[PDB]
Amino acid sequence: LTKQPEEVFDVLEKLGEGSYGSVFKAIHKESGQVVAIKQVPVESDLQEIIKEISIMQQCDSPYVVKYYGSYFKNTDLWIVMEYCGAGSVSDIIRLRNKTLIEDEIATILKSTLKGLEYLHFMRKIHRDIKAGNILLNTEGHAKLADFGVAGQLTDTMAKRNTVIGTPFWMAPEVIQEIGYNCVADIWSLGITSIEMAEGKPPYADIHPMRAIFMIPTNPPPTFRKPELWSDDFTDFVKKCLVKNPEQRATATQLLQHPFIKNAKPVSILRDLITEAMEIKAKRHEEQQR
Amino acid sequence: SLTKQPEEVFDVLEKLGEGSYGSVFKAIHKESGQVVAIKQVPVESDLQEIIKEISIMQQCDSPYVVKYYGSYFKNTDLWIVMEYCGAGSVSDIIRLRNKTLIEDEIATILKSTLKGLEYLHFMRKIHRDIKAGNILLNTEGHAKLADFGVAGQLTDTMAKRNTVIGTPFWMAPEVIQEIGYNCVADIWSLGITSIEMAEGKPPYADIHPMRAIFMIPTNPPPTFRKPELWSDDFTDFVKKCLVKNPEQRATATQLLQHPFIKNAKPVSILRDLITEAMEIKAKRH
Ligand SMILES: CN1C(=O)c2sccc2N(C)c2nc(Nc3ccc(S(N)(=O)=O)cc3)ncc21
Ligand SMILES: CN1C(=O)c2sccc2N(C)c2nc(Nc3ccc(S(N)(=O)=O)cc3)ncc21
Numbered sequence A: 001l002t003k004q005p006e007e008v009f010d011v012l013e014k015l016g017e018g019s020y021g022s023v024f025k026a027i028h029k030e031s032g033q034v035v036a037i038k039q040v041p042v043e044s045d046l047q048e049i050i051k052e053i054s055i056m057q058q059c060d061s062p063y064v065v066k067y068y069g070s071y072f073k074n075t076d077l078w079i080v081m082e083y084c085g086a087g088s089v090s091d092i093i094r095l096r097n098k099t100l101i102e103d104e105i106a107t108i109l110k111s112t113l114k115g116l117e118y119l120h121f122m123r124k125i126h127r128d129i130k131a132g133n134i135l136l137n138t139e140g141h142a143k144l145a146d147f148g149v150a151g152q153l154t155d156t157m158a159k160r161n162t163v164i165g166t167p168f169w170m171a172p173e174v175i176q177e178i179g180y181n182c183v184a185d186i187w188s189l190g191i192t193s194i195e196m197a198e199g200k201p202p203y204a205d206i207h208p209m210r211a212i213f214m215i216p217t218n219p220p221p222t223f224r225k226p227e228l229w230s231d232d233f234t235d236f237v238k239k240c241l242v243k244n245p246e247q248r249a250t251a252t253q254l255l256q257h258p259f260i261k262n263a264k265p266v267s268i269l270r271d272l273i274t275e276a277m278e279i280k281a282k283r284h285e286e287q288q289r
Numbered sequence B: 001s002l003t004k005q006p007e008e009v010f011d012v013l014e015k016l017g018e019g020s021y022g023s024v025f026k027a028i029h030k031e032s033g034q035v036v037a038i039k040q041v042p043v044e045s046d047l048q049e050i051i052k053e054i055s056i057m058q059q060c061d062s063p064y065v066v067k068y069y070g071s072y073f074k075n076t077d078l079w080i081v082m083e084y085c086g087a088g089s090v091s092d093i094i095r096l097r098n099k100t101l102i103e104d105e106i107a108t109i110l111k112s113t114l115k116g117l118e119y120l121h122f123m124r125k126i127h128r129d130i131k132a133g134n135i136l137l138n139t140e141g142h143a144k145l146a147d148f149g150v151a152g153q154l155t156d157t158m159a160k161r162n163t164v165i166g167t168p169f170w171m172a173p174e175v176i177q178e179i180g181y182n183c184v185a186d187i188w189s190l191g192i193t194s195i196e197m198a199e200g201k202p203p204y205a206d207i208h209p210m211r212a213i214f215m216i217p218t219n220p221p222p223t224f225r226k227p228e229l230w231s232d233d234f235t236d237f238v239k240k241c242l243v244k245n246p247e248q249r250a251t252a253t254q255l256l257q258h259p260f261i262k263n264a265k266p267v268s269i270l271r272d273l274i275t276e277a278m279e280i281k282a283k284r285h
């Protein structure tokens, strides 16, 4: 039908920043469905975006964010994607201003691993795994998001030579330029675990360009305070943060791991999520005044 | 629905024809059953340019201009959903019949075409590829401008574009010369198109395009292959369109007031010509 994008979608306040554009809350008028729309400038390189969109379409999982459609308004591309009420793990940490406790981390990580396992089965590498790109259901289920820099592998033994991602979370092999597998994501997950636990990635204080050079050379990162963390969690991170890819555990293996195995159900998350929202609203209500 | 797969949303049928940057396929919207024409564009193609084409279509709201319904991504391809015209392009109509258009048919088509141009120019956009191929007829016989692949926008109504683009036979002299050109450039194409409808091909058509492009700026304005057949009014109209200098060339609005355009019969006359083409088309199937 000849219906404009505004006719189709009623657009609310911007949620946050997507990899290529800001992301906005929106409603689908015909169904009353809530969706997230990312507005991308025409200036941005489209070919890369099309590739990102294709990967999302290929994916069909509860742990991966769905792509619904795209529209053109003015001279911009709007990409319509599944909406997660809770927001990014990073957002939840920021609103509460409290880092996650181990039980929360384990439950979230377990869901993320199931998502990674799906992507990996599908021979795709996310390449940007970080807390910001892990998204939560109001129900508290976790999904992988923002496959802006994601890559595809032809075969089990195929590798990618491209160096891309967010530097703090980037695998050393990726930096080394040897070429790498899906396993690169697993290292990134390890940095993320630290991120949830301590609220920032290692080397966060140093400039990203300086940091990128250091990572291959340096020994694997460790908790700032070892004393605080449990044996299972410490091991799980230790396993993720292995410099040499062959040594590093797969997502399938990790799910077997005790820290993941004993992880509590998504319900335990609910109070934390509720708090994050109420904090969000108050800031919103304060914003109205 | 909102999350439905691209195959789910649209049923795609036979390829209608060829449009710039891709090929156009007949499709049926499953929800409404409405019929649309969808053009499939390669990812490797210059999307930034394509986005520009789509926005121009969105900006237009005319009976005389083809309508943009939306786009979707399947595979790596970008699919553009556009209004479907049953009659097809004038070129299709000429080709299927194998008969060139009579004066009465031509004037009626031009009037709608001129009306479309007048609107386009009002919005300060130059189509830049006006040809029989790009003029589309619905079953009713109303005519619409179709292809916006090379279409250009003027930042200011005063402003001009130096870009050299289009299909070479229909190209205006001002464009071929690197001197700046505006909306009036379309009118020249309109003149070439009128000849094309009468003779079934453009002037120089049997000649090589590179050879022709060089000639056009230097050369005298084109004339009917046999002048005897054509009327005084049609002859004058073509001459007004085909003026080497942009400044002395007529505006679309001026052309609408022109006698050949003014005396045009209603679209109802077109009915016999359209029917024959469609009837022919079914038989070939
Ligand atoms: C689809 N999507 C994304 O791709 C990405 S990737 C990085 C961020 C996003 N964003 C912004 C999103 N935020 C949401 N939902 C959501 C819900 C609440 C909030 S909050 N913390 O401002 O209340 C943010 C995002 N849902 C989905 C996304
Ligand atoms: C939207 N559109 C176009 O943009 C353009 S521009 C140049 C060509 C087109 N095409 C291919 C089209 N053909 C149609 N409809 C249509 C219907 C019948 C036939 S025919 N002559 O094969 O029976 C051709 C096109 N409808 C629309 C188009």
Ligand SMILES: [Cl-]
Binding pocket: none
């Ligand atoms: Cl399970």
